[PDB]
mmCIF file of N, CA, C and O in Angstrom:
data_model
loop_
_atom_site.group_PDB
_atom_site.id
_atom_site.type_symbol
_atom_site.label_atom_id
_atom_site.label_comp_id
_atom_site.label_asym_id
_atom_site.label_seq_id
_atom_site.Cartn_x
_atom_site.Cartn_y
_atom_site.Cartn_z
ATOM 1 N N UNK H 1 65.005 -120.718 -19.331
ATOM 2 C CA UNK H 1 64.474 -119.327 -19.472
ATOM 3 C C UNK H 1 65.643 -118.339 -19.471
ATOM 4 O O UNK H 1 66.749 -118.681 -19.094
ATOM 5 N N UNK H 2 65.377 -117.135 -19.895
ATOM 6 C CA UNK H 2 66.459 -116.108 -19.926
ATOM 7 C C UNK H 2 65.891 -114.737 -19.541
ATOM 8 O O UNK H 2 65.018 -114.216 -20.208
ATOM 9 N N UNK H 3 66.400 -114.182 -18.478
ATOM 10 C CA UNK H 3 65.898 -112.848 -18.040
ATOM 11 C C UNK H 3 66.626 -111.729 -18.798
ATOM 12 O O UNK H 3 66.606 -111.691 -20.013
ATOM 13 N N UNK H 4 67.254 -110.844 -18.071
ATOM 14 C CA UNK H 4 67.975 -109.724 -18.747
ATOM 15 C C UNK H 4 69.171 -109.278 -17.901
ATOM 16 O O UNK H 4 69.395 -109.788 -16.822
ATOM 17 N N UNK H 5 69.903 -108.319 -18.404
ATOM 18 C CA UNK H 5 71.090 -107.827 -17.645
ATOM 19 C C UNK H 5 70.643 -106.889 -16.523
ATOM 20 O O UNK H 5 69.939 -105.926 -16.755
ATOM 21 N N UNK H 6 71.064 -107.194 -15.330
ATOM 22 C CA UNK H 6 70.675 -106.343 -14.168
ATOM 23 C C UNK H 6 70.910 -104.861 -14.476
ATOM 24 O O UNK H 6 71.559 -104.516 -15.443
ATOM 25 N N UNK H 7 70.370 -104.018 -13.638
ATOM 26 C CA UNK H 7 70.547 -102.551 -13.844
ATOM 27 C C UNK H 7 70.375 -101.818 -12.509
ATOM 28 O O UNK H 7 70.427 -100.606 -12.449
ATOM 29 N N UNK H 8 70.173 -102.579 -11.465
ATOM 30 C CA UNK H 8 69.996 -101.956 -10.120
ATOM 31 C C UNK H 8 70.344 -102.969 -9.022
ATOM 32 O O UNK H 8 69.969 -104.121 -9.094
ATOM 33 N N UNK H 9 71.057 -102.513 -8.028
ATOM 34 C CA UNK H 9 71.447 -103.434 -6.918
ATOM 35 C C UNK H 9 70.210 -103.913 -6.150
ATOM 36 O O UNK H 9 69.344 -103.127 -5.818
ATOM 37 N N UNK H 10 70.157 -105.200 -5.891
ATOM 38 C CA UNK H 10 68.994 -105.763 -5.136
ATOM 39 C C UNK H 10 68.162 -106.700 -6.021
ATOM 40 O O UNK H 10 67.166 -107.241 -5.585
ATOM 41 N N UNK H 11 68.587 -106.875 -7.243
ATOM 42 C CA UNK H 11 67.820 -107.776 -8.159
ATOM 43 C C UNK H 11 68.215 -109.239 -7.917
ATOM 44 O O UNK H 11 69.003 -109.530 -7.039
ATOM 45 N N UNK H 12 67.663 -110.134 -8.700
ATOM 46 C CA UNK H 12 67.996 -111.579 -8.499
ATOM 47 C C UNK H 12 67.942 -112.354 -9.824
ATOM 48 O O UNK H 12 68.928 -112.920 -10.253
ATOM 49 N N UNK H 13 66.793 -112.361 -10.445
ATOM 50 C CA UNK H 13 66.659 -113.120 -11.727
ATOM 51 C C UNK H 13 67.259 -112.328 -12.893
ATOM 52 O O UNK H 13 66.597 -112.053 -13.873
ATOM 53 N N UNK H 14 68.505 -111.984 -12.753
ATOM 54 C CA UNK H 14 69.197 -111.225 -13.835
ATOM 55 C C UNK H 14 70.627 -111.750 -13.969
ATOM 56 O O UNK H 14 71.065 -112.536 -13.161
ATOM 57 N N UNK H 15 71.337 -111.297 -14.964
ATOM 58 C CA UNK H 15 72.739 -111.791 -15.124
ATOM 59 C C UNK H 15 73.628 -111.121 -14.075
ATOM 60 O O UNK H 15 74.288 -110.138 -14.346
ATOM 61 N N UNK H 16 73.620 -111.676 -12.892
ATOM 62 C CA UNK H 16 74.436 -111.081 -11.796
ATOM 63 C C UNK H 16 75.909 -111.487 -11.923
ATOM 64 O O UNK H 16 76.721 -110.735 -12.421
ATOM 65 N N UNK H 17 76.222 -112.674 -11.481
ATOM 66 C CA UNK H 17 77.642 -113.128 -11.558
ATOM 67 C C UNK H 17 77.986 -113.516 -12.995
ATOM 68 O O UNK H 17 77.613 -114.572 -13.465
ATOM 69 N N UNK H 18 78.696 -112.646 -13.663
ATOM 70 C CA UNK H 18 79.063 -112.937 -15.074
ATOM 71 C C UNK H 18 77.797 -113.034 -15.922
ATOM 72 O O UNK H 18 76.961 -112.152 -15.892
ATOM 73 N N UNK H 19 77.682 -114.104 -16.657
ATOM 74 C CA UNK H 19 76.468 -114.286 -17.506
ATOM 75 C C UNK H 19 75.505 -115.264 -16.826
ATOM 76 O O UNK H 19 74.483 -115.620 -17.377
ATOM 77 N N UNK H 20 75.857 -115.675 -15.634
ATOM 78 C CA UNK H 20 74.979 -116.631 -14.893
ATOM 79 C C UNK H 20 73.944 -115.865 -14.065
ATOM 80 O O UNK H 20 74.207 -114.780 -13.584
ATOM 81 N N UNK H 21 72.786 -116.446 -13.919
ATOM 82 C CA UNK H 21 71.714 -115.759 -13.141
ATOM 83 C C UNK H 21 71.730 -116.177 -11.660
ATOM 84 O O UNK H 21 72.164 -117.259 -11.316
ATOM 85 N N UNK H 22 71.248 -115.293 -10.821
ATOM 86 C CA UNK H 22 71.170 -115.608 -9.359
ATOM 87 C C UNK H 22 69.959 -116.528 -9.105
ATOM 88 O O UNK H 22 69.594 -117.315 -9.954
ATOM 89 N N UNK H 23 69.372 -116.421 -7.949
ATOM 90 C CA UNK H 23 68.189 -117.274 -7.651
ATOM 91 C C UNK H 23 67.239 -116.538 -6.708
ATOM 92 O O UNK H 23 67.638 -116.110 -5.646
ATOM 93 N N UNK H 24 66.002 -116.399 -7.116
ATOM 94 C CA UNK H 24 65.020 -115.686 -6.242
ATOM 95 C C UNK H 24 65.202 -116.127 -4.785
ATOM 96 O O UNK H 24 65.393 -117.294 -4.510
ATOM 97 N N UNK H 25 65.139 -115.176 -3.892
ATOM 98 C CA UNK H 25 65.325 -115.502 -2.448
ATOM 99 C C UNK H 25 66.690 -114.992 -1.985
ATOM 100 O O UNK H 25 66.985 -114.970 -0.806
ATOM 101 N N UNK H 26 67.494 -114.595 -2.938
ATOM 102 C CA UNK H 26 68.850 -114.067 -2.601
ATOM 103 C C UNK H 26 68.841 -112.529 -2.712
ATOM 104 O O UNK H 26 67.798 -111.912 -2.644
ATOM 105 N N UNK H 27 69.995 -111.945 -2.874
ATOM 106 C CA UNK H 27 70.052 -110.460 -2.991
ATOM 107 C C UNK H 27 71.366 -110.036 -3.654
ATOM 108 O O UNK H 27 72.415 -110.069 -3.041
ATOM 109 N N UNK H 28 71.280 -109.647 -4.897
ATOM 110 C CA UNK H 28 72.515 -109.224 -5.620
ATOM 111 C C UNK H 28 72.844 -107.759 -5.308
ATOM 112 O O UNK H 28 71.960 -106.958 -5.073
ATOM 113 N N UNK H 29 74.116 -107.450 -5.314
ATOM 114 C CA UNK H 29 74.550 -106.044 -5.033
ATOM 115 C C UNK H 29 75.437 -105.544 -6.180
ATOM 116 O O UNK H 29 76.603 -105.877 -6.258
ATOM 117 N N UNK H 30 74.861 -104.751 -7.042
ATOM 118 C CA UNK H 30 75.641 -104.226 -8.205
ATOM 119 C C UNK H 30 76.586 -103.101 -7.774
ATOM 120 O O UNK H 30 76.797 -102.882 -6.600
ATOM 121 N N UNK H 31 77.127 -102.429 -8.778
ATOM 122 C CA UNK H 31 78.085 -101.282 -8.560
ATOM 123 C C UNK H 31 78.370 -100.997 -7.085
ATOM 124 O O UNK H 31 77.487 -100.640 -6.332
ATOM 125 N N UNK H 32 79.607 -101.159 -6.713
ATOM 126 C CA UNK H 32 80.000 -100.891 -5.303
ATOM 127 C C UNK H 32 81.526 -100.704 -5.233
ATOM 128 O O UNK H 32 82.217 -101.359 -4.479
ATOM 129 N N UNK H 33 82.013 -99.795 -6.041
ATOM 130 C CA UNK H 33 83.484 -99.527 -6.069
ATOM 131 C C UNK H 33 84.260 -100.815 -6.378
ATOM 132 O O UNK H 33 84.901 -101.383 -5.515
ATOM 133 N N UNK H 34 84.177 -101.253 -7.607
ATOM 134 C CA UNK H 34 84.908 -102.493 -7.997
ATOM 135 C C UNK H 34 83.995 -103.718 -7.892
ATOM 136 O O UNK H 34 84.138 -104.664 -8.641
ATOM 137 N N UNK H 35 83.078 -103.678 -6.968
ATOM 138 C CA UNK H 35 82.151 -104.837 -6.810
ATOM 139 C C UNK H 35 80.981 -104.700 -7.789
ATOM 140 O O UNK H 35 79.974 -104.093 -7.482
ATOM 141 N N UNK H 36 81.143 -105.277 -8.949
ATOM 142 C CA UNK H 36 80.067 -105.176 -9.978
ATOM 143 C C UNK H 36 78.958 -106.195 -9.708
ATOM 144 O O UNK H 36 77.820 -105.981 -10.071
ATOM 145 N N UNK H 37 79.301 -107.290 -9.081
ATOM 146 C CA UNK H 37 78.254 -108.316 -8.825
ATOM 147 C C UNK H 37 78.620 -109.231 -7.656
ATOM 148 O O UNK H 37 79.773 -109.557 -7.443
ATOM 149 N N UNK H 38 77.611 -109.622 -6.927
ATOM 150 C CA UNK H 38 77.827 -110.537 -5.770
ATOM 151 C C UNK H 38 76.493 -111.191 -5.389
ATOM 152 O O UNK H 38 75.627 -110.553 -4.822
ATOM 153 N N UNK H 39 76.352 -112.449 -5.708
ATOM 154 C CA UNK H 39 75.071 -113.146 -5.381
ATOM 155 C C UNK H 39 75.037 -113.515 -3.887
ATOM 156 O O UNK H 39 75.341 -114.629 -3.509
ATOM 157 N N UNK H 40 74.667 -112.558 -3.070
ATOM 158 C CA UNK H 40 74.602 -112.821 -1.597
ATOM 159 C C UNK H 40 73.156 -113.161 -1.195
ATOM 160 O O UNK H 40 72.230 -112.885 -1.925
ATOM 161 N N UNK H 41 72.995 -113.752 -0.041
ATOM 162 C CA UNK H 41 71.616 -114.122 0.410
ATOM 163 C C UNK H 41 70.823 -112.872 0.826
ATOM 164 O O UNK H 41 71.361 -111.785 0.892
ATOM 165 N N UNK H 42 69.554 -113.064 1.097
ATOM 166 C CA UNK H 42 68.695 -111.912 1.514
ATOM 167 C C UNK H 42 67.380 -111.915 0.727
ATOM 168 O O UNK H 42 66.836 -112.962 0.433
ATOM 169 N N UNK H 43 66.896 -110.739 0.407
ATOM 170 C CA UNK H 43 65.613 -110.644 -0.364
ATOM 171 C C UNK H 43 65.785 -109.706 -1.564
ATOM 172 O O UNK H 43 65.852 -108.503 -1.411
ATOM 173 N N UNK H 44 65.853 -110.280 -2.735
ATOM 174 C CA UNK H 44 66.019 -109.438 -3.955
ATOM 175 C C UNK H 44 64.658 -109.153 -4.591
ATOM 176 O O UNK H 44 63.631 -109.355 -3.974
ATOM 177 N N UNK H 45 64.682 -108.687 -5.817
ATOM 178 C CA UNK H 45 63.396 -108.382 -6.517
ATOM 179 C C UNK H 45 63.466 -108.897 -7.987
ATOM 180 O O UNK H 45 64.484 -108.748 -8.632
ATOM 181 N N UNK H 46 62.382 -109.496 -8.498
ATOM 182 C CA UNK H 46 62.375 -109.990 -9.884
ATOM 183 C C UNK H 46 62.564 -108.829 -10.866
ATOM 184 O O UNK H 46 61.636 -108.097 -11.141
ATOM 185 N N UNK H 47 63.762 -108.682 -11.373
ATOM 186 C CA UNK H 47 64.012 -107.568 -12.338
ATOM 187 C C UNK H 47 62.843 -107.490 -13.364
ATOM 188 O O UNK H 47 62.739 -108.342 -14.225
ATOM 189 N N UNK H 48 61.976 -106.473 -13.267
ATOM 190 C CA UNK H 48 60.843 -106.361 -14.198
ATOM 191 C C UNK H 48 61.331 -106.260 -15.648
ATOM 192 O O UNK H 48 62.511 -106.125 -15.902
ATOM 193 N N UNK H 49 60.406 -106.329 -16.566
ATOM 194 C CA UNK H 49 60.790 -106.246 -18.004
ATOM 195 C C UNK H 49 61.102 -104.794 -18.384
ATOM 196 O O UNK H 49 60.262 -103.964 -18.081
#
């Protein structure tokens, strides 16, 4: 399957780290002064369409 490019910090099923997708149940953190992506644990949200 293929989702889409993230657009808000806290997503999961999106292209977080590079072109690879994270995994529901985690928590990605976008834009953060140099930190464009980081698949960290926590509770993210299924990037809607």
